[PDB]
Amino acid sequence: ILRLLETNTVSALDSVFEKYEKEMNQMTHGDNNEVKRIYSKKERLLEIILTKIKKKLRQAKFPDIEYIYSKRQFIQNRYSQELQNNERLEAILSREQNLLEETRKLCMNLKTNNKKRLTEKLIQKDVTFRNDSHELNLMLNDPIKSTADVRLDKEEVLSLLPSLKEYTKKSKELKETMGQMISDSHEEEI
Amino acid sequence: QLSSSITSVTTIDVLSSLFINLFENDLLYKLDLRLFQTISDQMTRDLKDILDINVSNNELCYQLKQVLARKEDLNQQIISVRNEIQELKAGKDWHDLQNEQAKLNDKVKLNKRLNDLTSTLLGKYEGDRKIMSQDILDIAHFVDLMDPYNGLLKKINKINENLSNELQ
Amino acid sequence: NSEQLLHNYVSDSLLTTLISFQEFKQQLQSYTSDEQQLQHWYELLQARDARVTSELEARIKQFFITLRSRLLRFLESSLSLETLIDALYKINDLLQQRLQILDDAIQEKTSELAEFENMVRSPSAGDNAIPGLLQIIQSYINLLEEN
Amino acid sequence: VERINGLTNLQKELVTKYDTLPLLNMNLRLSYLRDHTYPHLQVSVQSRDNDGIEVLVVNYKFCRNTMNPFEIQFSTLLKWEILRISTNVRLKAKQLLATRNFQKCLLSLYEFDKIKSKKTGIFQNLINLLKRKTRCYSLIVERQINFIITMPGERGKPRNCFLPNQIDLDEICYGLIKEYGVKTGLKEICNVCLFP
Amino acid sequence: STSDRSELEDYIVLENVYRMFGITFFPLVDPIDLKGEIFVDREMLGIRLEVFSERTSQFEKPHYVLLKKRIKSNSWFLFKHTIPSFIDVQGIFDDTNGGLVISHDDAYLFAKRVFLQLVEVQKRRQIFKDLEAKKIIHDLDLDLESSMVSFFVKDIKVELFVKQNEIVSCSSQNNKSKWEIALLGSLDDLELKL
Amino acid sequence: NAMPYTWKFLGISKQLSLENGIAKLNQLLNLEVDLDIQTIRVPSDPDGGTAADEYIRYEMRLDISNLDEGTYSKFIFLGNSKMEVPMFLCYCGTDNRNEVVLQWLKAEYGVIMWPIKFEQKTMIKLADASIVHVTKENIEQITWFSSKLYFEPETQDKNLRQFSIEIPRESCEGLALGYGNTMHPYNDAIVPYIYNETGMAVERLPLTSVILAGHTKIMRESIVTSTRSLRNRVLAVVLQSIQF
Amino acid sequence: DTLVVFKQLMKLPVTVLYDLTLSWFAKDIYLLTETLDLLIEKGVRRNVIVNRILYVYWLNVFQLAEIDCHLMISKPEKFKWLPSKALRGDGKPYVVKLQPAKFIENLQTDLAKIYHCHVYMFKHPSLPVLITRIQLFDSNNLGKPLISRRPYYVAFPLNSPIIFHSVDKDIYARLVLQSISRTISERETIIFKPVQKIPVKSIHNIMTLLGPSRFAESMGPWECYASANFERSPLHDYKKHQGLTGKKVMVREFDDSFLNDDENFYGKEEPEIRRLRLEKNMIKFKGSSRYSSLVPIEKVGFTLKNEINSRIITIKLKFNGNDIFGGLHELCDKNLINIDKVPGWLAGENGSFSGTIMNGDFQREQVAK
Amino acid sequence: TYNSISNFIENELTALLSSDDYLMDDLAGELPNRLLKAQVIEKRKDAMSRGKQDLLSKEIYDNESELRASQSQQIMELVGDIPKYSLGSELRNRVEGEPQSTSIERLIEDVLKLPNDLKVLSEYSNLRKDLILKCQALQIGESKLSDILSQTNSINSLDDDISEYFATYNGKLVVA
Amino acid sequence: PQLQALVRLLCETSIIDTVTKVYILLEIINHPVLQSALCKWLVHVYFLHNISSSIWLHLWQFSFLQKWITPLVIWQATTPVDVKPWKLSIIKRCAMHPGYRDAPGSATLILQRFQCLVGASSQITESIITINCNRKTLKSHRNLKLDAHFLSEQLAQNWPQLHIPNDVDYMMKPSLNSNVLLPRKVMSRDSLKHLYSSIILIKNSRDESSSPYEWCIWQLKRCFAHQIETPQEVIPIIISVSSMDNKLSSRIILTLKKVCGGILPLWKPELISGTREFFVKFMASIFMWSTRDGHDNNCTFS
């Protein structure tokens, strides 16, 4: 019973340290006591009776604590971090289910836009441009898609454009003076 | 099992109680008294604590394992959520928004501009009787560039063609 | 960490104090034997297997407290008009950037059409062009009229 | 079960075509070529030994136009000239051939012919309406819908933006040129001329 | 013989000029043809696809796009081809005339669309990999279609992203505003910056 | 391969009728076993020219307490004297009694034996012989199932190994009626069909094992079925196979 | 662990690649160059290089120090794939992509599973980058390290519609795919990769089969359009003999079908006609131990919905094998299948798509897993 | 039952003493070995023990408060339901400066501003407006270059109608 | 007395099972053990005629093999092992179906084995005695025609069959002349006959021939050495001389071995032709001798 005697020795020593704590507690709760040489001799007598009981227990050998704190705390900490991970993933599914019902609401709003284009076409009930625009070739123009109006551009027209349009009007009057000469060539073939 | 140390604790309690009877038979002894009953009850609840702590950890191990399976439900669940939130921007790319800007501008914006223009020129329905002028750089360029080269060479070779008519 | 705090609370600051509550009944009430009630406390509340009752309390109360935190999450789900004006200003600014880019490239197209052709076409003269044109035109018109 | 070689006569190889390659010459190459690229082409070879070569690009929709090249090597990387132009275009062709690269050039000259053709093909069946219609140089004479033919130095292939109570007309015509076809855009402009 | 061997050589030089025209068609038939009278019930246009370089001023590996007569009704839907799939064939195909492509001219402008779509890829690789790669010492590398392009200017690493010959991305306020530019401005701005 | 009745085949040198020494077999193995003897004039639909249809399938009917194919172990011995090899031996199951049966069959008659690793034309012929179901009117209707003509051509380097051809029952009737009418649907339609489609001369092919659906697994030499019997025209053509 | 890494590091060659690995693994280093110089000339005791560096300079930050094993067993081919398109809700694809923006999905999976690494790579004949991507997931036992469970790969080529991720079909596999869906979005664009053909083989013969190659459909009887092996350039007299080319008289007669299906006899022909049979085979399956394929297709299943007499005619046709179509000219050389009536779809031109053709209308059968 | 389960926990804790001296099971012979003074001492004990439930009422609210605070650090660290994206990188790091995409995303942030995330980074919005104004000056510079390049052509480049009409009519009448 | 007689043979052997198996099979005609069952095959031939043993072989084993049998080789090997060292009944009965399936779709590899069976079968030429020249000449002719017919490898197999059956039949005639009762007259007959057939074969094999050279050499030696060791064939001196115009064709050919054979034929001819008549046969023989001597005075270079 080697492990039995070892655990008994360790547990009795832990009880001896807690006995020292209890002896200090009784000394603090005592009238006037400061020697404790009787306490040390009592610890010696306890060790003597402990060895005698160890003889009696090794005779009747009829056939782990900080280890317990350690393994218990090991699995507690593992469980706690596992729980932290759980609420993290719970946070992320809460965020994305919030997002799922958001975009689901917006696709229902697109369905309301379907009913609204029915109503908005009901107020006034009255494709091959790709094939033609690449049959010939043409260009398109889009300074639009802005909710604020763009005819008030004359804020930021100021950079070079009014000077530009004045000089183009000057060139327009110059080409009018050049196109005076067409008076011969109006209807030379009509 | 722990019944052995339990029996040893019982024997230590009996002997410490005999010494307690001797001490309290003559009275000092308060310290020794609390010493050996602390020995006794500490030994008891410590052996009791370690054995049922073995039991408790041996079960909450597998309750932890159950919450690991709960984590697995989390991962499958967020796969499904992220999946559907992904292809829900596919049906929003789809026909809904497409027909929205395919008929919205069609029978709102352009028909707005058209009916505004018909309110203008139907409101002055006399256009063939009033103006017809819809009230330039391109005509400027093609006229002012067809004149000095093409007009000159066309005229001089047309007059030389008249010379070919005249001699021949 | 929260579960760590909660079992540390329930184990330490409750059950160790309950054991202290047990042992302070020998010391200062009287001088009697004062242990009979201690073993009857043992024998009676050995249905509180305190480790197991503490862990069951943890695996109840920590969980519904997290449910309560889920409840009290919801909080959101003046002077901003200046930045709203700044945003509308940048809206005009970039719409102007697009429109000015189109007008810039169109004017550049007019430039590349006009300047290069009119310069390198007649070998860079720009003399009195319409005068010579009308002169040869009147001469050719007189020749054709005589024809 | 014979084994002759094959340079011509469809029937023979059209039986004995167990491969899949380009078919072969006889004319069905060049018939597909000419008949599915409509204005024509002529040559003469002028070998050397490194090969000066001519061509006669018969541009052919109604009024002719042509061109002629210079030498190659047999490795096909040598240099090229223009030696005959028709005067329907004088200097816009030199805008083009200012640069090299005959692929783009020829295509434009080709698609440019198709552009002139479709320009006329729109103008005749808009003139067909027998109301107050009058005639202009290159646009219309009613109420001034012009449009350029740029043959630019940006993208290599000629693109044609349009022109049509001024800016209003601009965005309206840009709108209506997205629903009912270009061949009917004149019919639409007729509609805003006919009733109002 | 040599009686019409000159005639054949004339025809193939006519072919050579017709294929520097670029897009061409050319008949072929795959051996699915029942009946020496012989039916052909599936016909192939077959569109060879040829690009002119400048840097060598050659022609390349031509591409090839060959469609075929659909069984039911007089159509031309796609068959095997080869242009590398960073260019779509299928969508830009059936885009034209609703996928309902019958004549040869709509087929022609189909291949035209493919062609110039191919060729400005060739043009911008012909810009990068030649001109400032060799004039400027440059230590260049690039993508298959030239879109992440990164190099030394002479000194340092600059990435830029390209689109329809217009620069969008760049890798300083100096740097960024000098280079969100057009392609013809790119070589000029590397001339200027030094 | 989900059906029990395994029917390895065996040929006979010369015919000897059997009812003489059925006491001898019943003597040697001590177990009463019926020998049935019955004339059938297959082609029972007479489109075969009526040429020596004396077909007397001897049925060693091992009729004991039915606990196995080692208990029900029926044999069929089809004979025709006016054909050169006269007679073959089928046998079902997996019994150990069959060994001394055939051993005695060698012994008491003095006949010599060989198995039949039969071939492609064989497999196709009896394949569509399997689907003509026997009617009591003897004008026999045509069942249909779904073929799964597993091959296994080795080539060099195991490159091809194995390639199926599976036909839905619908398409079986399709190519039947489009032929049109026959009693030889496979060689009349289906192998002509797939020759005209995939150019696969399945006659010439290294076939290994046609499965027909839920009903047989014709193999390289060993027809397996899901019936305690073999159809008589099937037995006729497998006699026809080995002949000359 | 050390057994596993020894199974890996025995597959390696030695030459100087071990030297460069251990060089940056060691990031002493002055005279470590003179350790490794001698161990270059003592590059002899080949297998025990492993444990000696694995003990001298020796699962937390060590991951890149082992993942170069993947970097260099990319040398061989052994493992598998499967492809996946990249749609946008219209059938338009793209994968135009700047390289280093992979911290994005690094952080994005790090929001959802624990700290983690993935080297990128770059193959050096074939121009993808590939993402060896190890999911560090767990640590449990019922000891402080974490589990590197399953290196899932995503290789994508430059500028394709296609990526091909590796084949695991798991709740971590699909999770990483779900992440890499969204982290390549970047514009609130919509990616949602759907799947193609299920089986596969290795890298070169997946990208030349499909992706950003020029064989998008060029293979089968058509590789003379893949290569440009005729009609060279503007040249002159090569094209004259290219207009003076050979051929068999492989007559398309039905009587020829009687000659081929029926009418079996002896050799009775010179090596010319035997040659012409052989290149009928060759031109049918390639287009020119030589007798393999170009590309190992591994198993396919074709289908055939004819309609005949206004009535559907349906045969299915599954293959197996270790490379088919090379197997089929090695079958057809034996004059076992009668070559002129071999249509294209089982001539093998589609590149391993088990499609369901019907009256010449080959398809793909989308068929998600 | 936040502190109520613990309230029943401490109640069942003291109820051992309550049921013990209430039955007086050992207390019947303990006077031999507090008549009711023992139970008086017992509820003295339990009134002392209610300090623990005072600590419950403290620490439960402490825990819930700090977890609410952690939730506050979460919403401050993540985007507060703001999926806005390339500015959503731009406010944290430069990537490339795509004026196309920054322009277009700038055409989508101006939706319903007054009619979160750190007052929506008005400084980064001002930085983008400043950068766009810098580009606007960069474009206007080339506009001035075009103006000054076109102006040097106009100055350099810049009766007989009826006379030529009479001459052409005379040509018609003298040739036709 | 065969009950106790074969039991006495059991007293001289150790194989009771085969004894009782004779008294009641395919085990035996599959295979101490092997020689003992061989003696059982002999004993079955004794106690039978040849039926109950031989019928196994001479119908069913080759007539599997004409269709197919698996190993295909050990069966035919034992077949020849049985019938070759045994009865002319088995021999001629086998040879009937041999010539027939020869004229029918011959398998051209089994017919090699049947040719070996004939090659020992001086039993065959023995027991026929009536018109073997009919049967064997017809078989040789059919093989020649069909060899050219599946010729037009094709030509090499034509060479292989039409020469190998020839060599085997020549060995058969060699055995016939070893007996030579009336087999001498038939030996002259078939000897000149197959010599002529191989001569026309060499007319289809003039400048392209491989094996048939050895065949004609075999024929010539089978004339020559037989006539040298047996000078009793003076009525067959016509046959011994009869290689004249064929010998022109034979010296008309590398033919080193052919010339060696011709030298042997002519040398034994000049030896045993001194007893012949100096008018008709030996005049032609010495004429050939003079022609070959002129060929020798031409071989002094050529």
Residue numbers in the entry:
A (entry chain F): 162 to 224, 233 to 295, 323 to 386
B (entry chain I): 124 to 150, 170 to 277, 289 to 321
C (entry chain J): 2 to 78, 84 to 153
D (entry chain D): 125 to 173, 177 to 201, 210 to 272, 279 to 284, 297 to 317, 333 to 364
E (entry chain C): 153 to 187, 193 to 328, 337 to 359
F (entry chain B): -1 to 242
G (entry chain E): 16 to 42, 50 to 80, 84 to 167, 191 to 336, 374 to 454
H (entry chain G): 4 to 36, 40 to 121, 135 to 177, 187 to 204
Direct quotes from the study:
One such assembly is the Ctf19c/CCAN, which anchors the kinetochore on chromosomal DNA. There are 13 Ctf19c subunits, and these associate with a second complex containing Mif2/CENP-C and the Cse4/CENP-A nucleosome. We present here the structure of the Ctf19c determined by cryo-EM. The structure provides an overview of the inner kinetochore and the coordination of its various functions by showing how Ctf19c components are organized relative to each other, how this organization positions defined Cse4/CENP-A recognition elements, and how the Ctf19c supports regulated recruitment of outer kinetochore proteins that tether the chromosome to the microtubule tip.
We assembled the Ctf19c from individual parts (Ame1-Okp1, Ctf19-Mcm21, Nkp1-Nkp2, Chl4-Iml3, Ctf3-Mcm16-Mcm22, and Cnn1-Wip1) and purified the recombinant complex to homogeneity by size exclusion chromatography. We used these images to determine the structure of the Ctf19c to an overall resolution of ~4.2 Å. A twofold symmetry axis in the calculated density map related equivalent sides, which were separated by a central cavity. A refined map corresponding to a single Ctf19c protomer showed amino acid side chain density for much of the complex, guiding modeling of individual polypeptide chains and their interactions. For the Ctf3c and for parts of COMA that are not well-resolved, we fit the density with poly-alanine chains and numbered the residues according to their approximate positions. The structure shows that, rather than a network of binary interactions, the Ctf19c/CCAN is a defined complex in which subunits interdigitate. C-terminal parts of Okp1 Ame1, Nkp1 and Nkp2 form a parallel, four-chain, helical coil. Our density map showed that yeast Chl4 shares these structural features and also enabled modeling of the Chl4 linker domain, which connects the two previously-described functional modules and provides extensive contacts between Chl4 and Ctf19-Mcm21. The map also showed density corresponding to the β3-β4 loop, which extends into the Ctf19c central cavity and contacts the Ame1-Okp1 coiled-coil. The Ctf3 trimer (Ctf3, Mcm16, and Mcm22) and the Cnn1-Wip1 dimer form a complex that recruits the microtubule-binding Ndc80 complex to the kinetochore through a flexible N-terminal extension of Cnn1. In addition to contact with Mcm21-Ctf19, which is described above, Ctf3 contacts Iml3 through a network of bulky residues in both proteins that fixes the position of the Ctf3c relative to Iml3.
